[PDB]
Design a protein around this nucleic acid. Structure first.
Lengths: 25, 62, 220, 84, 107, 103, 127
RNA sequence: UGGACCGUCGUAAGACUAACUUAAGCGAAAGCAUUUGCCAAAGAUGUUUUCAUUAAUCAAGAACGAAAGUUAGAGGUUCGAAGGCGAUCAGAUACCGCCCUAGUUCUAACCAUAAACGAUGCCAGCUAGCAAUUGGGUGUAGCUACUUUUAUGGCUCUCUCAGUCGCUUCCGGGAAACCAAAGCUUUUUGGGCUCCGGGGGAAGUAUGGUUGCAAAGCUGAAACUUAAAGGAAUUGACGGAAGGGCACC
């Protein structure tokens, strides 16, 4: 729930989505 | 260690599980030591009381 | 192993300590060093000891109030149950140092490092506070930092002159009556009126040699 | 009381302790004294808030005292708080 | 909903003010937001004075005291009950009460 | 206690274990107990005798114990919103009791 | 006639020491503590044990002829507590009421000029 | 085990600047406490000095930026993400307990954020008391210091700037809590100036540009979903919070 740990639930998508996207280049 | 002691003044009894009058009490041969001991059970003023452990009294305020 | 069958304290023999000449009576305690052996020298363990005593125990003070000058002495040279015990510094007891520092004041502390004409190189730790004036309803009485860095210089140019200053035959006699807290107060009251001033600590970090000749003269 | 009928003419003494800027005009509390040192003779005129060690060319006796605002002559003063 | 005029405690024009470890939980709480208690307590506590002054050597010596300035986290002085829960009209006071006697715990 | 530094610190850590347990029992204490919670059924290991029964038998069964505690007879012959508020009915007991003497 | 050792009573949380020694401090007389007197590993701090320490030292130094002592409390304040624990007053009553006629009652607990970083870490010891 | 812990004197180290310590100061904000020397700087006051609108505020842009983090070099005491134990627990990758590693620290750069809060942009004027209170000014028709009645120094009294902090109140505003500004935003109001908000989510997400060694930073949607979500205050718990006061359900 916490407003801070969702900033981290999402900041660790943005490096799964940046990793996965740029391995596919 | 057969010291006797008589009470000059009662203080409050912390009752609920172990009703005991924490009472100020002086000895007979060492009557200048009006120590504040804890006496389980019903007591009256001026009651003389036997003792062995006459050294420290388990200090608790009021 | 050692394994003494009874009481290594029975090996310990009493030794009577002796103060130097300037204070008072000399016997001020009893040290317990083991009786000597081939590789136990009774002379050898006594030399390091820095012994703690008060000034009231050295000035015939029956009512302890002026006791706070803890003149630590160093057990210097021994002979025949009698160490000679040179001087090693002077703290101030914490019942008296911590008592002075209330809030509502500014303390000024000066620390010097000055060498006597003898080879000792001391370090004296003076302490000031600002005295409240009469009819001062204002509850602070604070100094102004050019009224502190003045006073911190105003102590440092004084108590250096007492160090080059009729030394430890006589310098500790100035510490007997605390004359140095009397020269400070008149000389600082031209700047800001100071409260009780005391020098609180001296450190004797550079003792030169023996000079047993003067030391036996120092044991008068 | 703030509801006074009059604000233009004040009492004399309060505008003498209002400010140098907050009076009904501006007027400085400076002036030009005429200091003669008691140790010598020369008529010297100076600013009150002088800010300069101003002793005479042949009379360097005391003539002034060095400080922030108005120089405060101690026991070496003889002047006149007046236009010279 | 602002609870205090001064917020936490007393930070007027400094920007930011140094921390202090709380005395019994070692919590970094700042200096002005710190329940400062300053005890001058006797060393025998009032019942051994009649026992020490028997075995005193001198003319009663009179015995020294302690000198320490204790800091507290705000929880660790609500739990110790140095400081509790004033009313809404009594959160506005700083100056009273003792009102009874000299205060104990010195004594 | 084992002050002997010429005995293994990595193996006297268990010699300090199973001997402090037997010394307290040798004076007055209850034998240590560990309840093997197998499949919706318990097995209390209270005495040393059932504890010593238990140890050698799982050198033979071993890893299929939970599936043989519920099924094997001869091993069973030898050895013979509704949820949270019972799961916190007991945690409230501890915090009220492990904190009243906290100071 | 009179002879003066010291006491060095170190009374903390969880334990109390009574360490009577020379006027120097080196050669000790009756090193014992209260923690070697009650067999519970929590009872070490009790005022009974500080007496039960001081019921032993105050006679033993008399067997070494000690007539008089000086007292030095300790808290254990490093960065830490900086007040003597529960059995500090329990010793000096037990020591002085065993015919050791003493005067010097000092408190050498350490007191630093803002030294390093006590443990717990910035929120620590959550209970 | 015979010598930990304690005592003691001694050596080496790295870190930190207590007590004094404040509703005290300084700083553009971040932040800022041993002595001293140096080093440029600055607000305030004092000013019958000079210049004469040189000003205000600011898109872009520029410098500074706690902590963590990163690159290299040193050091490395205590503390200590992670790690490993010991417990605790129904479980505990947690709290508590021990060990410590990166980190903490110093120079060289990068990063550019924070509850970076006064959740209050900035310059100007006005509208009230009272109490302190840091600087500087000024009058003692004050005391006091002794160097002397003195004079420098301190205190007290009086006034004034620049203020700051509190209270008291509006006899101003507000949804209120409150605010001497959050007031003079009056009755369809006007001292300039800039930045920002438009029901809640989705979402600081997706994608493009741009900066970074990287972590990440700045820019930044919509499809879709939905009727409430939110602010302040009252009354419900003498329901696991203090302080009281009862009775053998």
């Amino acid at each position: 729930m916490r407003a801070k740990w969702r900033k981290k639930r999402m900041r660790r998508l943005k490096r799964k989505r940046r990793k996965m996207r740029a391995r596919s280049k | 260690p057969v010291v006797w002691a008589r009470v000059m003044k009662v203080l409050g009894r912390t009752g609920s599980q172990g009703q005991c009058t924490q009472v100020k009490v002086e000895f007979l041969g060492e009557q200048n030591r009006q120590i504040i001991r804890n006496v389980k059970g019903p007591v009256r003023e001026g009651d003389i009381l036997t003792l062995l452990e006459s050294e420290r009294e388990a200090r608790r305020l009021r | 192993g050692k394994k003494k069958v009874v009481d290594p304290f029975s090996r310990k023999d009493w030794y009577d300590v002796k103060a130097p000449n300037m204070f008072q009576t000399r016997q001020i305690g009893k040290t317990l060093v083991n009786r000597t052996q081939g590789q136990r020298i009774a002379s050898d363990y006594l030399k390091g000891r820095v012994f703690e005593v008060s000034l009231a125990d050295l000035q015939k003070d029956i009512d302890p109030e002026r006791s706070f000058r803890k003149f630590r002495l160093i057990a210097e040279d021994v002979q025949d149950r009698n160490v000679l015990c040179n001087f090693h510094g002077m703290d101030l007891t914490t019942d008296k140092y911590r008592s002075m520092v209330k809030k509502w004041q500014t303390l000024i502390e000066a620390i010097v490092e000055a060498k006597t004409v003898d080879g000792y190189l001391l370090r004296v730790f003076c302490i000031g506070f600002t005295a409240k004036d009469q009819q001062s309803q204002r509850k602070t009485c604070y100094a102004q930092q050019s009224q502190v860095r003045k006073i911190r210089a105003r102590m440092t140019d004084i108590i250096t002159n007492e160090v080059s200053g009729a030394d430890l035959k006589q310098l500790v006699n100035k510490l007997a009556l605390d004359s140095i807290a009397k020269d400070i107060e008149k000389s600082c009251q031209r700047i800001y009126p100071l409260h009780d001033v005391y020098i609180r600590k001296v450190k004797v970090l550079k003792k030169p040699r023996f000079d047993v000749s003067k030391l036996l003269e120092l044991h008068g | 009381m703030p509801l006074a009928k009059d604000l233009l003419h004040p009492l004399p003494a309060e505008e003498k302790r209002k400010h140098k800027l907050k009076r009904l005009v501006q007027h400085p509390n400076s002036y030009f004294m005429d200091v003669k040192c008691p140790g010598c003779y020369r008529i010297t005129t100076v600013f009150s808030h002088a800010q300069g060690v101003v002793v005479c060319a042949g009379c360097a006796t005391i003539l002034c005292q060095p400080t922030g605002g108005r120089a405060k002559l101690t026991e070496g003063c003889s002047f006149r708080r007046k236009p010279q | 909903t602002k609870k205090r005029r001064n917020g936490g405690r007393n930070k007027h024009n400094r920007g930011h003010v140094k921390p202090v470890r709380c005395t019994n939980c070692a919590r970094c709480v700042p200096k002005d937001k710190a329940i400062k208690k300053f005890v001058i307590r006797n060393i025998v506590e009032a019942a051994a004075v009649r026992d020490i002054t028997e075995a005193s050597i001198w003319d009663s010596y009179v015995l020294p005291k302690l000198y320490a300035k204790l800091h507290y986290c705000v929880s660790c002085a609500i739990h110790s009950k140095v400081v509790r829960n004033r009313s809404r009209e009594a959160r506005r006071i700083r100056t009273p009460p003792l009102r009874s006697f000299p205060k104990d715990m010195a004594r | 206690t084992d002050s002997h530094k010429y005995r293994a610190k990595r193996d006297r850590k268990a010699q300090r274990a199973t001997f402090r347990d037997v010394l307290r029992y040798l004076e007055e204490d209850i034998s240590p107990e560990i309840s093997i919670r197998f499949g919706t059924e318990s097995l209390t290991l209270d005495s040393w005798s059932i504890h010593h029964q238990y140890s050698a038998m799982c050198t033979v069964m071993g890893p299929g114990m939970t599936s043989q505690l519920q099924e094997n007879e001869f091993i069973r012959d030898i050895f013979q919103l509704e949820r949270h508020l019972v799961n916190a009915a007991a945690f409230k007991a501890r915090s009220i009791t492990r904190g009243k003497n906290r100071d | 006639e009179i002879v003066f050792g010291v006491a060095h009573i170190y009374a903390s949380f969880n334990d109390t020491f009574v360490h009577v020694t020379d006027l120097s401090g080196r050669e000790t007389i009756a090193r014992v503590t209260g923690g070697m007197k009650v067999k519970a590993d929590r009872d070490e701090a009790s005022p009974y044990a500080a007496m039960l320490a001081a019921q032993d030292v105050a006679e033993k130094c008399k067997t070494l002829g000690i007539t008089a002592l000086h007292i030095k409390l300790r808290a254990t304040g490093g960065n830490k507590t900086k007040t003597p624990g529960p059995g500090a007053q329990s010793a000096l009553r037990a020591l002085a009421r065993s015919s050791m006629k003493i005067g010097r009652i000092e408190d050498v607990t350490p007191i630093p000029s803002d030294s390093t970083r006590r443990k717990g870490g910035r929120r620590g010891r959550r209970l």
